[PDB]
Structure formats: structure tokens, C-alpha cells
Design a protein around this nucleic acid. Structure first.
Ligand code: NA
Ligand code: NA
Ligand code: NA
Ligand code: NA
Length: 327
DNA sequence: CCGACGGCGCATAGC
DNA sequence: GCTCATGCGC
DNA sequence: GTCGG
């Protein structure tokens, strides 16, 4: 369905969502508004009334009422009011810096730190993550075209193999499902030496090599199993440089790797659907394992998994290609 | 009526 | 010095 | 804010 159908409604609900999550600190209302916006985005008719919307799951009495106001007047009084409120619009805005959540945004605005410029003058008050988020504010809000994702994957897979040819690495996310663009890069890493029953430098060696070839440019956080940072493709002699990009790398034990690859490939609705069907066949699937449920619901030991297909086989599903996992 | 709505790795008050 | 709740992002 | 036990 294109924007012209119900765009005004879904923009409104998304705006309301953000203020719940950044100003009111009401995460479940944020998700309620997002759920409503998405079920409306998939509705293939221009909505004529709130009552019509209320038949969709996730739209209830209050959003129906809102839609009625929006349809009759072309706006929402409460949203118009909050939009012009200097304090709340600043809190909302500051959370677009990665590392600034609702709490940090709230304290900054309470101190009169309201703009990107203000944060720039107050680096003393920013932790490491927030400084990186500030430095790359614009680049982090850009999407990554798939051709660049392919070039980034070339580097990651080459450097990983160079460190140890027994590493296994998979770029997941919507990119693995064929997406034409991405918001970041999500890399899943394992090694045969690393199981649930088994070194503390497996992740570090890969991060270090990616830094040595100057692909990784900054680190947001890094422990023994998860790295979150910044990377940039190299630019040619005269060309404009590429944007800095968000990259996460996680090291998963080999016996949980393909459950991990399944989960972080998605989509989210595909994941819900697969887990629902697994319950009906007597299995519980999470990020890490698939386990049988006993007749009284008691989970057994994780089942051995050596491919994504093994998981599909356990639950009597035909193997779905990543490109066919939109739901 | 009223609890659940995801859970966890990593960076950063309280004893 | 330590443990760990909280914030944050995903 | 919405859903459902
Ligand atoms: Na509904
Ligand atoms: Na944000
Ligand atoms: Na943020
Ligand atoms: Na090797």
C-alpha cells in the first residue's frame, strides 16, 4: 500500500509513538502506537473512519478516536501542542543521538542542553558512546544501499578468513533476505573451538584485524561475545568519502550458531510465525536453541542443530529461503 | 479488573 | 576496591 | 494503548 492511502495516519501514530518512548518513558505505549501504525500501513484501502480502523488488531478505542479527529480536521490537537513544546520536542530530538536515551535526553534538557550544537559545546558531559553518536549523527541516519553492503561483506569475510580460515561468518538482517538497503550491518561469528561446553580472544582478533585494515573506525562497546562499533568503506583517490556505518559483530558458540543465524535473519514476523508453529509441534525455539516440550510442558535438552534446515526439519517445515522470510 | 506486552551484553550507585 | 541496578541498543 | 485471562 502506498503512502497516499494512510500515510497521514501512520505518520501521526509514529510521532505519538516517539513521544511516548522518549518523553513519557512509556515503552509499551510506544510499541502500541507502532503496532497500530504498522497494521494500518498494511491495510490496502484509504481509511474512512476510526471505527473502520478499530477492526484491525492493535487499533483500539483511543486510536480510533484520534483517527476521527485527524480525518475531520487534518491534525491532532495533542500532537500539535507537543510539537511546539520546547522542552518535549528537544527531549524527543536528542534521543536521535545513539547513546542518548530518554533518561540522558531528559537530564540534558533539564540543564539547558537542547541542540546538537549544545552537545558539541558540552563534550565533558557525554560518555564515549554518546560522543561517537554525536560525531556521526547524520551518517547514522542514512541507509546503506545493498551494493555497499556487498562491498562491506567482501571486506568482513576476507579479513575474518585471513585471521583464521576456520571461522564462520554470516551477515544477517534484512540484507540476508535480499533487501535493497540496510540500516546497519549485523555479523554473526563462530568457530569450531567455541561451544557451549568449551578462547577469550576469538572476537577480539577479528575486531583487531578489521581495525588494522582501517575498516572499523570506532568502538561503541566490546566484550568477549559482542562488538558494536563503526566502520567505513575506503574511498577512491578523488571520490567523495562514504558515510560511516553501524556494524555489530557477535560471537556465538558453534552449537547455537544456526539458531542465532535463523533469529537474526528474521524477519520479526517470520520469527513469530516460526516459533508459534514450533510450539504447536511441541518444540520451543529461541535465539539460542530448539528444545522439545514434554507432555506437561517441561522443556528438554537442546536438540543438535548443524544448519538452518535442521531447525525447519525438526518442526516439519519445508526449508524457507531467506528471501521468502518476510513473514 | 488488571497484568503483559523480549531478554540480554556491555558501559556506567552503593557498600 | 567490589557487586550490581540502571540505561541503552538491539 | 491494546489485548485478553
Ligand atoms: Na482493534
Ligand atoms: Na533514538
Ligand atoms: Na539515542
Ligand atoms: Na586455521
Amino acid at each position: 500500500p502506498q503512502e497516499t492511502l494512510n500515510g497521514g495516519i501512520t505518520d501521526m501514530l509514529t510521532e505519538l509513538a516517539n513521544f511516548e518512548k522518549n518523553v513519557s518513558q512509556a515503552i509499551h505505549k510506544y510499541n502500541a502506537y507502532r503496532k497500530a501504525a504498522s497494521v494500518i500501513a498494511k491495510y490496502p484501502h484509504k481509511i474512512k473512519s476510526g471505527a473502520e480502523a478499530k477492526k484491525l488488531p492493535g487499533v483500539g478505542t483511543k486510536i480510533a478516536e484520534k483517527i476521527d479527529e485527524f480525518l475531520a480536521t487534518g491534525k491532532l490537537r495533542k500532537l500539535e501542542k507537543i510539537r511546539q513544546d520546547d522542552t518535549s520536542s528537544s527531549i524527543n530530538f536528542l534521543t536521535r543521538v545513539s547513546g542518548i536515551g530518554p533518561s540522558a535526553a531528559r537530564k540534558f534538557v533539564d540543564e539547558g542542553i537542547k541542540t546538537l550544537e549544545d552537545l558539541r559545546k558540552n563534550e565533558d558531559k557525554l560518555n564515549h558512546h554518546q560522543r561517537i553518536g554525536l560525531k556521526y549523527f547524520g551518517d547514522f541516519e542514512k541507509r546503506i544501499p545493498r551494493e555497499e553492503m556487498l562491498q562491506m561483506q567482501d571486506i568482513v569475510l576476507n579479513e575474518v578468513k585471513k585471521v583464521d580460515s576456520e571461522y564462520i561468518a554470516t551477515v544477517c538482517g534484512s540484507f540476508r533476505r535480499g533487501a535493497e538497503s540496510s540500516g546497519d550491518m549485523d555479523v554473526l561469528l563462530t568457530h569450531p573451538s567455541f561451544t557451549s561446553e568449551s578462547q577469550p580472544k576469538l572476537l577480539h582478533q577479528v575486531v583487531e584485524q578489521l581495525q588494522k585494515v582501517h575498516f572499523i573506525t570506532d568502538t561503541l562497546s566490546k566484550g568477549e561475545t559482542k562488538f558494536m562499533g563503526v566502520c567505513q568503506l575506503p574511498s577512491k583517490n578523488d571520490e567523495k568519502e562514504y558515510p560511516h556505518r553501524r556494524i555489530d559483530i557477535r560471537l556465538i558458540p558453534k552449537d547455537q550458531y544456526y539458531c542465532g543465524v535463523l533469529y537474526f535473519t528474521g524477519s520479526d514476523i517470520f520469527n513469530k510465525n516460526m516459533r508459534a508453529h514450533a510450539l504447536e509441534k511441541g518444540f520451543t525455539i529461541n535465539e539460542y536453541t530448539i528444545r522439545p516440550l514434554g507432555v506437561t510442558g517441561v522443556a528438554g535438552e537442546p536438540l543438535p542443530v548443524d544448519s538452518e534446515k535442521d531447525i525447519f526439519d525438526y518442526i516439519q517445515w519445508k526449508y524457507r529461503e531467506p528471501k521468502d522470510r518476510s513473514e
